[PDB]
């Protein structure tokens, strides 16, 4: 699956979306630099409206997961 397609479900817990996201990104055939860029660019962008609202308002992965 392309990492671009991993999007948080409307009722999916943020931790579960994070898990799916990292699993898919680990499976992508890409350099570590490209994978890092994808985490900074897609993780908040592909979150559902509720979590996007909280995340934008703030950042580490551990701060993101607590805020949601």
């Amino acid at each position, epitope marked *: 699956t392309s990492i671009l397609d991993i999007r948080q479900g409307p009722k999916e817990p943020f931790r579960d979306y994070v898990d799916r996201f990292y699993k898919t990104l680990r499976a992508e055939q890409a350099s570590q630099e*490209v994978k890092n860029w*994808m985490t900074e660019t897609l993780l908040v962008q592909n979150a559902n409206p509720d979590c996007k609202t909280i995340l934008k308002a703030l950042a580490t992965l551990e701060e993101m997961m607590t805020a949601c």
Partner: nanobody
Framework: QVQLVESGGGLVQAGGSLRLSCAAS????????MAWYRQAPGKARELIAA????????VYDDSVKGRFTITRDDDKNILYLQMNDLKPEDTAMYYC??????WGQGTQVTVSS
């Protein structure tokens, strides 16, 4: 399945250039992040370049740095991959991708010598 459509592939000698285009006329497809992938027969489809709208940040695989440039034209809704200084190792099918798009048929790049 908004399906993206790649074009601009061709047959060129090593050192030459190409420009791939990706579009879906009549479709609402440009996502905040877009990427180009490439796949040689029987090999993993690899993520080689990506761009993010707004700040226009870009990232590239080490094998294409300083040779390829990903750009997007927001008015025309076209994503491009400029390819300079081509190498036989660049020979592959190239695919573009947006968040939620279906995979296109790709465009073939063949580099001789």
């Amino acid at each position: 399945q908004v399906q993206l459509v790649e074009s601009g592939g061709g047959l060129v000698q090593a050192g030459g250039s190409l420009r791939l285009s990706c579009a879906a006329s009549g479709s609402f497809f440009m996502s905040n992040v877009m990427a180009w992938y490439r796949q040689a027969p029987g090999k993993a489809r690899e993520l080689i370049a990506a761009i993010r709208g707004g700040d226009m940040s870009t990232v590239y695989d080490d094998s294409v740095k300083g040779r390829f440039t990903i750009t997007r034209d927001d008015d025309k809704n076209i994503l491009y991959l400029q390819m300079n200084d081509l190498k036989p190792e660049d020979t592959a099918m190239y695919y573009c991708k947006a968040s939620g798009s279906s995979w296109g048929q790709g465009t073939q790049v063949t580099v001789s010598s």
